[PDB]
Structure formats: C-alpha cells, structure tokens
Design a binder for this molecule. Structure first.
Ligand SMILES: [Mg+2]
Ligand SMILES: [Mg+2]
Ligand SMILES: [Mg+2]
Ligand SMILES: [Mg+2]
Ligand SMILES: [Mg+2]
Ligand SMILES: [Mg+2]
Ligand SMILES: [Mg+2]
Ligand SMILES: [Mg+2]
Lengths: 44, 106, 95, 120, 50, 354, 55, 122, 51
RNA sequence: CGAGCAGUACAUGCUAAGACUUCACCAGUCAAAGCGAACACUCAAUUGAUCCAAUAACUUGACCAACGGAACAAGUUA
RNA sequence: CUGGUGAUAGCUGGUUGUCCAAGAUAGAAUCUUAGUUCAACUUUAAAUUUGCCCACAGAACCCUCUAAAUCCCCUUGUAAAUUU
C-alpha cells in the first residue's frame, strides 16, 4: 500500500526495460566470413 | 456515448478478519492479490477462503508456473539477483480438523 | 386490488399471485426464478442450476403478497403427501 | 484427514501435500530430499556422503541419480514415509535421470502420489 | 527571505497554525496551503509572507 | 502520504544505469534457485513463515548425547581420494557407467551410512516426530551408538525397528531381540516408552520395558526393572509412537524407586515420564541410542485390555466439528427451499398439537 | 448479423428419449456426438434430428 | 475536499523552553486533565461533535476531569481547538470519604478538600 | 502522558464491562407495569356523596 | 472507442456448505465437500422478464434496440 | 336542456381545539423526471448485545513519479447499536 513502508515492493517494470559511434567506442561492426566450405563458415 | 457503473470490486475481508469456508475475500479485475495458503481462486479472479480462520496479508516471492509463457518470459529477462514479490492473502486455520472422542467401552 | 366487492362487499384475491407464488403457513412465500425456461442454450450449467430452484421472497414482497390474498390462502392445509408439508413451520428460529 | 495447504494456484510449486520429494542436482553432486509441508526435512540421500560416493564412478550422471533413489527408497520405508509427491518442471520430467529416479522410488515401494484428504 | 523567517518577532506563523490545525483553521484552508505556507494565493505569489 | 521503508528493498542493489550490460537469468531454474534463497531469509515485512512457520525459541537447544568422535580429516580425505582413482581407473566401471547399467549394492551402502552420518539423520528424523519435544522438552542428543531392535515373528522372520516404521502389536507380542555394539565392562540402560499410549493424561506416558545395568551387549543379563508389556493403542485413536531408548551408564545406579512388580498390569504404575526420570539420573547416565516405531490397533490389542489389563477396551472415534451455518433469519431473501433443512433437527414429519 | 451457426437437437441412440440442444455450424454435416445419458448413467451416441433455430 | 486532520507527532513534543513557561514537569507528568469546552460545536464537523459528547463536554464552561492517558489524549488531540486543558492540582492530596462534601475546584486548577468560606486568619 | 500505550491496556476492562451490563439489564427489563385491583375500585369514589 | 460475436468442448453431467452483488427489486457472480466420471472453457461487453405460441417430452420463439419490454395507433391547428 | 355524473384531473386552491415529544438531502426503475414503486432516511413498539470513538498490523502493480485522506481497527472514552 502507498502509505505503508513496503510500497513499491512489487515493482518489476523498471528492472526489464526502464546506432551512434563515439570517438572511443565503435558503433556497429559487421563480420563477414567468406569461405568455399559451408561448415567452416558456420563453425567460425 | 457509453454509460457504465462501478463493479463494487475490492477487498471484502481485511487483515485479521475471521472468515468461514467459502467466504469471498476479494474480487478483482486482474490479479492484484494472489491466493495464498488455504485460499482458492474462481473464474473471475475471485478469492475465497477454503478454510475457516483469520485472513492475513503478506509479501511472498513470486515464482510463476513454468507453463505460463508470458510470466516465464518475464523472469528470464530480469537482471541476475533480482527477485519478484507480490501480495498474497492467506487464511490461518483456527480449528483442528477433528478430535478423538470416547464412544464406547467394549 | 378490490378492497370491497360490488356484490359481497368483501375483499377479493388477485389471481396473478396465486398462479405464481406459494405461501408457506409460517409466512414465507416461495416463487420461481424469472427466466428458467428462456434461452437455456446460452446459459452455463451453474447459471441454470440456480434458475431451476425455488427461492423465498423478502420482507417487503411477502408483506405485499399478504395484502393481495385473502385468508383462504393463509390457512393451514393438510394435503396428503404434500411435497412442501415439512416447510410450513420454522424450527429453532429466534427473534 | 490432516488438511493440505490448498491454494497457491498462480505460483509454482504447489503446497497441497504432506510430503514432497525434492531432487537437487548440482554441477558435481545430486541430492534428493523428502521434506514435510512445514519445511522440515524427513530423510535425505545425496552423493556428498562417503557411503554413496565410494560406489559411484561419477556423482553427476544418470547412474548416480538412479542410485540415490534406490538408497532413498530404503530410507523412506524405514522412516515410515510411504506416500510423497513429486513436482518436476516440464524439462525435468522429460529428462532421463529423473525418470529412473521415479522408477527407483516406485520399485522401492514408495508411491509418488499422496492419497486424497478425507473431508467427511 | 530566509533571514526574515529567522528574525521574525511574531510568534505565530502560517505554517505552524496550518500544520497543527490550530483554531480549526483547516476548515477554511486548502490542502495545497500545507506546502505553500501562505505565500501563494491562486496564481499570485506574496514575497512579503513569511 | 508516504512512509520510508524500515529496511533494505529487495531489488535496491540493482543498478539501473547500465541495465543493458547486466547478466540476466535466461532460464526458469536459475531464477527459481535464487528465489528460494531469499524466501528462507528474515524480512522486516510480514511473511508466510511469520504466521504459518513453526515458532521456535531463539535460545539454542542443548545437546545431551555422547561427544562426537575424533577423526583426522587429512588422513580421512587422502584415503577417500585414493579409492576414487582406482574405481575410475577400471574401464569396465566407466563402460557400465556410460551405458547406464551400473548399480550400487544397497546393503553395503547402509553399512557405511549407519556408521558415518546415520546418527545425524536419526536426530533430524526424531526432531520431525517431535520426540525431543515431548521426551526431553526440546533437549536434543545425537544417537552415537546404533541400536538394532527386532521382534521374533514365528521362527524364521524378523520385524526390525529402525525409526518410526509401522509395527503391529501382534508382531510385538514378545520381547524383541536387542543387539548393539558395546565394549566389555560398560553399563547400559534400555528403555521403551509409549508417548501417545496414555489414556488419561496427554502429557504422561506409559512404560513398556525397562532394563538397567546391562553388561555389554548381553541384554538378558541386565536387571529386569519392569516386565515387557505389548503396546495397546486404543481402537480409533490413530497412530501411536513407541520409542526405544538406549542409555550409557558411567556408574552403577539403583532403580529401586522406579522398580515395578512382575507382572505390572496397573496403568497407575505403568505411567512414566522420561523427562523427570532422566532429570534425576543425568549425572550418571547419558543417552547413546535411539529407536522408535509407529503402532496401530489390531486384534491382539483386545487380548491386552481384557486378559492382561483386565478392563474394557475403550473405543475412540474421529469427530469433526459441526458444520457452520449463519444465524437463521425470518425472511431469507433469494435462498433455496433447502434453506429450512439446514436448521431442522428431525427429518421426520412433525404435527404439533394435532 | 448473418446466421453462421444453427441450433440443433441431439437425440440419444439408447432409446431412453434423453435429448439435448447444441450449437453447430450451418455448413456442416449432421453431428454424431458421444454425450452422457443420465438415464443409463453412461456416455452414449447421439444423433442430430431436427434444427431448432438459426443463431 | 475537507477531511479529518492528522496532527504531526512533532507538535505534541514539549521543548525545553516550554517547561519554563507553563511550569510542567516531564519527569512527573500530571495524572488528570481538567477539560473545559470554550467553543461551540456548531459549524464544526460531525466527528468533532461526537467526540465532545464522548468526553462529556455538552455544556460549555463546565469543567470535567479526564485521565492523562494516550487513548483519552487521542480524542483531545482531535478537538483541541474547542477545549481548554489544565492539569488537576492536589496540594492537599486526594479527597477522602470524609472530605467528599467539602471539595471545591478553583479556577487555578487546584482541588482543595477544605472549603470553609472564611477569611484567612494569617 | 502519565502512562504509555502498553500500561494503559486493560486497566479499565472490568468497569467498562460492568457499566454495559447495566445498559443490558435496563434494556432487557422493559415490561408492562403491574395492574392493581385497588386502582380499579378507587374510581367508584367519583359518585361519593354526603348523606 | 467498442459490444448485439465467435471459437474450443460434448460429464459445457447431477447435486450441495459458505459468500459476492452495479447502491431497491428483478436479474447477475463465485464456490469447498459429495455422487458420477476423467487421470464450474476461452472471452471487458457479446444481451430481453411476464403473458402467449409451438412441442409427446425436452426445449425453442421479439434491431420487444423507446433494450424493466403497452398484443396492435401518424401528421396538423395562425 | 336533462340524464349517465359526486365524470375525470400525476394540475391549482383549501383542509377548522390545546400542549408536549422525536424528526432534512445516498440511489434505482419508470410513456419517467409536476408522478409513483423500492431502497436510504425518519417514527413508534418489541427483542437482543454490543455500537461509536479507534494502537499497531494490513489493503497493486502500472504510463516514470507524485495530495488531503479513506477502509479495517484491539484499547480507551462512552451509550448506544443490531434485529423483530
Ligand atoms: Mg445490494
Ligand atoms: Mg419505454
Ligand atoms: Mg427504459
Ligand atoms: Mg438496469
Ligand atoms: Mg390564416
Ligand atoms: Mg375531483
Ligand atoms: Mg406528473
Ligand atoms: Mg423537538
């Protein structure tokens, strides 16, 4: 209850939820793996 | 233009009230209060006492059933160490199931 | 309601009450549920269970039905093998 | 005739039982417990004790799980506990090690379903 | 403003009376007055009110 | 109006700044294991354990058993490690373990179990039955000395009593065969009491067997303080539990006051309290063994009440409280016709004055 | 408000005369259900006989 | 909306400067109150009118003695703006059975057990 | 306050319970008054006259 | 901004403590135990009383939508 | 014009000795909002025992946060309350 000290004990929504690349960290990297063998690309 | 009236839903028996088997504790649109010890749930999320005793409200750890996909999908996305709490209503039985009485001397 | 008839000068009984209600001699009135034969295909078994049962009227309705019937319907009857014979008297009733 | 803690319909596991067989299988050990509704533990059987560890090639395989049930079933009969419930998750129920643990309890004389409470 | 509140020689203040419900004054006051402390009346602000 | 919490919040330690780079649960089992950990911890708010959990005194319960044995962990650990390598070295065991066909001998497992951790499981099991709660008013002890009690049924079968197993009075009609490991020159005291067998005083208990100053394992040579009396649980009284107590005596004790005539068929003398009996003998005696079994009613109990006890057998019946009905009202609104039957005593027709 | 479903009556094949009304799709063959018959206290076959009304 | 008023617990906490103005003693609190209604219950909420009846303060300017206990003080804290509270002083002590007919409550709060109506000879 | 909440509890239970029983006794003692034969005969004095 | 449905069942069987209730009534809602079986359906609303009519019984019948519903009746007047 | 006819009017108006006592504002349905029925309130009689005031404890998360408070309520102060 709101007036009780245990108010908000059941809150969970902020726990779950609540590109640009800066000069120090790269934004998004795409790694392309070209190989004649299908299994080698899947394994790597 | 739609006209409607309140459903008179809420707590029917507060903390410490004495209830009998079948007494309705709370009527809810959604699971605001979860059934605890000796408390059943009806079709419309209605909480009724399964035993005669005193109604208690506590906070307990919420561990959903594995079959419930929506609730399981929620706890799996929680940060490690987080625990969910929800309000449970319990009925503490007052009388024993029965007593042994002498009926004959054979 | 005819409080004084034009030929006998005595109170009459509304026959719309006799064909719908049953009066236990204790004072209670027993009726049916409005709609226990209507649209039973769209009703749940729990709903139909409480529709095909006989219920009692309240204080105001029982007082209303007493004024609409004469003393012939309030007398004690001794029908042979009457289904409601045991319900004509209250047991262990206080105040 | 003793009342079971009915309720807890929206949470898991249930509490409508007198005794529960709870199996704890960790990274290295496998442990099975029989505990009362109030939380007190009746009997125990784990791979940590030297009695069962000295006869197991591995304490984390199916054989270890099956061996715990055979040891626990003897302890359940001696303790007087003959009926208890088992409440596994859908993946634990489908697992092979839990299936043989259930078989060991059943072959040991323990029924994995408690008799219904008598109300009248 | 902080100086005026400290050196005010009047022993009676709006905050003290409103909070303690002295003379049953809350019957003619407002719930917002418990925080405004008499410095605000509608959309107007009164800097001279302590 | 708001009130600050009286203690730390459950999810207060979690930092919301870097929520994206925080490890999640990703599974139901990982959350469940953590969820149970916090459910067993004290909390400043109302909890299920507060109202339903069995209340216990904050004072630690005492231990009145024999001192724990002294074992060198380093030597114990090394010998255990060596056996594991030999077992895993064999290729037959690994093949059987991989094929899920290997099995352990259950008889050999219990032999080691009873010597290492058997007494500790018995203490935990005895606490569940509340034997320490009733016999010693909460005082606990570890049954360091295993006790083997078995009843001779016929000429070839035996009914062992380990801890709370079901034993019928017909099988327990004669004195059981009592064997236990003991050294020569030591004095022991066997004791059998029925906590629930009493018919008048719920607290008091009935004595069934009492032997004192037993030299070594030779139970027969011990003094017969009280003749053996079979359990007599009344019919319909439920399940009674009888506890076998094995005591270790340091000096010879005189039990003239606790002695009873042979035979003793009077329930006034058969009354026995373990707490008071042990209280005046605790100086020269210390519990060492423990065993108990559950007992029901059978046909042999009728022989005990009539022939042995010379009394009529009492019959009990489990009586439930009468069903609750609200106060009857003159005009029950919207109530079914069966409302009047709830408050009607006799099911037969009544006529009153007529 | 097109009538997609119709109300039909299922008559027990046990000869007890017990019948119950159920709702079925109009564009469908006659149903043959296995319903409980209180007269014989067991589940018996039922057959659609007459359409009551269009829902 | 106008509702019941919750007086903060801080208000009913005597400061050191208050004891030197009213002459009270925190270590030896007075046993009884002398409550006198000096304001009308008219134009006041119904819950304040009920408490006045419960305290036996129907007639104004009629002293009534109440016990200095938290439950009674709880009702006083609701109608503290309609009443005057004074401690009961007993310089001569509690009245005896032979002094019941000779008591008199003065305006100073003192209950004397010897009411002679005679000038002091001193 | 002279006493705390704990000390005050139950210090007036006996008097309050006895005070309510007086209300119960007064409420449950309501009954029509006694009718005396003397009062019926005293109405005959209305015709009392001198000789 | 919606609703006047639809879908899955065919024990969506029969009975019966104790309660909720749209501020009355009507109506509506939940339900332990028990018999009988198996090993109180989903859905915010998704609905209509009495009389009467049809039927062997069961049961069914109104955009009675002016939705507590009159068996059937418009306009105009300076 | 007479008779039915003292037509009917949810509408207007009127309603005749003395004295005392208790006594005002939740609603629902309705060819209904100028009306009526039920409930609430009020009155009288009766029966019974608790009634009011109220210490903790207790009453949800959401859309992120946020009011005066309210419900429940032992003591205690009080004398009412429920039922017929
Ligand atoms: Mg109502
Ligand atoms: Mg209409
Ligand atoms: Mg209408
Ligand atoms: Mg309506
Ligand atoms: Mg013209
Ligand atoms: Mg007229
Ligand atoms: Mg009108
Ligand atoms: Mg007046």
């Amino acid at each position: 209850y709101k007036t009780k000290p245990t108010h908000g004990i059941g809150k969970y929504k902020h726990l779950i939820k609540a590109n640009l690349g800066t000069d120090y960290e790269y934004g998004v990297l795409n790694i392309h793996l070209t190989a004649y063998d299908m299994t080698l690309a899947e394994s790597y | 233009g739609g006209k409607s009236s309140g459903r008179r839903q809420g707590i029917k028996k507060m903390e410490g009230h004495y209830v009998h088997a079948g007494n309705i504790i709370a009527t809810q649109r959604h699971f605001r209060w979860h059934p605890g010890a000796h408390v059943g749930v009806g079709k419309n999320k209605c909480l009724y006492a399964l035993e005669e005793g005193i109604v208690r409200y506590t906070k307990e750890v919420y561990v959903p059933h594995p079959r419930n996909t929506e609730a399981v999908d929620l706890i799996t996305r929680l940060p490690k160490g987080a625990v969910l709490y929800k309000t449970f209503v319990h009925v503490v039985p007052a009388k024993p199931e029965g007593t042994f009485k002498l009926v004959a001397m054979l | 309601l005819t409080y004084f008839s034009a030929r006998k000068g005595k109170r009459k009984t509304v026959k719309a009450v006799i064909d719908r209600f049953l009066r236990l001699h204790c004072g209670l009135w027993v009726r049916r549920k409005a709609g226990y034969k209507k649209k039973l295909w769209k009703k749940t078994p729990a709903r139909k269970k409480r529709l095909r049962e006989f219920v009692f009227c309240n204080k105001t309705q029982s007082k209303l039905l007493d004024k609409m019937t004469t003393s012939f319907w309030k007398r004690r009857n001794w029908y042979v093998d009457d289904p409601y014979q045991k319900y004509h008297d209250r047991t262990n009733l206080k105040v | 005739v003793a009342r079971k803690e009915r309720g807890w319909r929206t949470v898991f596991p249930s509490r409508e039982f007198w005794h529960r067989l709870r199996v704890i299988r960790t990274q290295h050990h496998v442990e099975a417990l029989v505990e009362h509704q109030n939380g007190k533990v009746v009997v125990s059987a784990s791979t940590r004790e030297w009695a069962i560890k000295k006869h197991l090639y591995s304490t984390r395989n199916v054989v270890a799980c099956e061996s715990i049930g055979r040891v626990l079933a003897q302890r359940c009969l001696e303790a007087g506990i003959n009926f208890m419930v088992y409440q596994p998750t859908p993946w634990e129920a489908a697992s092979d090690s839990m299936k043989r643990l259930q078989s060991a309890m059943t072959e040991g004389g323990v029924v994995l379903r408690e008799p219904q409470r008598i109300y009248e | 403003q902080e100086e005026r509140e400290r050196n005010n020689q009047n022993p009676w203040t709006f905050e003290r009376i409103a909070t303690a419900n002295m003379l049953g004054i809350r019957k003619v006051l407002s719930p917002y007055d418990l925080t405004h402390k008499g410095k605000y009346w509608g959309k107007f602000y009164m800097p001279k009110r302590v | 109006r708001r009130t600050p919490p009286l203690g730390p919040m459950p999810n207060s330690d979690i930092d919301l700044s870097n929520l994206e780079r925080l490890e999640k649960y990703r599974s139901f089992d990982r959350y469940r294991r953590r969820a149970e950990q916090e459910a067993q911890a004290p909390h400043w708010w109302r909890t299920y354990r507060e109202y339903f959990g069995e209340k216990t005194d904050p004072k630690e319960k005492i231990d009145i058993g024999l001192p724990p044995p002294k074992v060198s962990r380093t030597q114990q650990l090394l010998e255990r490690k060596q056996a594991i390598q030999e077992l895993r070295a064999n290729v037959e065991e690994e093949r059987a373990a991989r094929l899920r066909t290997a099995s352990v001998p259950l008889d050999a497992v219990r032999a080691e179990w009873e010597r290492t951790c058997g007494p500790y499981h018995k203490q935990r099991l005895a606490e569940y039955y509340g034997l320490y709660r009733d016999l010693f008013h909460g005082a606990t002890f570890v049954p360091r000395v295993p006790l083997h009690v078995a009843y001779a049924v016929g000429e070839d079968d035996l009914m062992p009593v380990y801890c709370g197993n079901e034993v019928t009075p017909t099988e327990a009609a004669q004195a059981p065969e009592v064997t236990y490991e003991a050294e020569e020159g030591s004095l022991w005291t066997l004791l059998l009491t029925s906590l629930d067998g009493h018919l008048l005083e719920p607290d008091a208990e009935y004595l069934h067997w009492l032997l004192t100053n037993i030299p070594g394992n030779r139970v027969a040579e011990g003094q017969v303080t009280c003749p053996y009396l079979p359990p007599f649980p009344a019919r319909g009284s439920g399940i009674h539990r009888l506890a076998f107590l094995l005591f270790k005596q340091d000096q010879p004790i005189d039990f003239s006051e606790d002695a009873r005539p042979s035979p003793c068929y009077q329930l006034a003398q058969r009354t026995f309290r373990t707490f008071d009996f042990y209280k005046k003998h605790q100086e020269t005696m210390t519990p060492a063994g423990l065993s108990f079994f559950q007992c029901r009613w059978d046909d042999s109990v009728t022989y005990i009440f009539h022939q042995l006890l010379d009394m009529r057998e009492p019959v009990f019946e489990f009586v439930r409280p009468p069903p609750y009905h609200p106060k009857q009202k003159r005009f029950p609104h919207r109530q079914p016709l069966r409302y009047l039957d709830r408050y009607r005593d006799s099911h037969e027709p009544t006529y009153g004055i007529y | 408000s097109k009538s997609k479903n119709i109300l039909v009556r299922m008559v027990s094949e046990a000869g007890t005369g017990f019948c119950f009304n159920t709702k079925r799709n109009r564009l469908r063959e006659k149903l043959t259900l296995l319903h409980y018959d209180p007269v014989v206290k067991q589940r018996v076959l039922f057959v659609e006989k007459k359409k009551i009304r269009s829902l | 909306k106008f509702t019941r008023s919750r007086i903060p617990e801080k208000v009913f906490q005597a400061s050191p400067e208050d004891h030197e103005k009213y002459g009270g003693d925190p270590q030896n609190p007075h046993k009884l109150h002398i409550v006198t209604r000096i304001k009308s219950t008219r134009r006041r909420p119904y819950w304040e009118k009920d408490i006045i009846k419960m305290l036996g303060l129907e007639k104004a300017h009629t002293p009534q003695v109440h016990k200095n206990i938290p439950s009674v003080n709880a009702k006083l804290k609701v109608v503290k703006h309609l009443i005057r509270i004074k401690p009961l002083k007993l310089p001569q002590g509690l009245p005896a059975e032979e002094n019941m007919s000779n008591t008199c409550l003065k305006s100073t709060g003192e209950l004397v057990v010897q009411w002679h109506l005679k000038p002091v000879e001193q | 306050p002279y006493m705390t909440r704990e000390q005050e509890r139950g210090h007036a239970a006996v008097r309050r319970r006895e005070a309510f029983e007086a209300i119960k006794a007064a409420a449950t003692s309501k009954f029509p008054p006694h009718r005396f034969i003397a009062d019926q005969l005293d109405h005959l004095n209305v015709t009392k006259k001198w000789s």
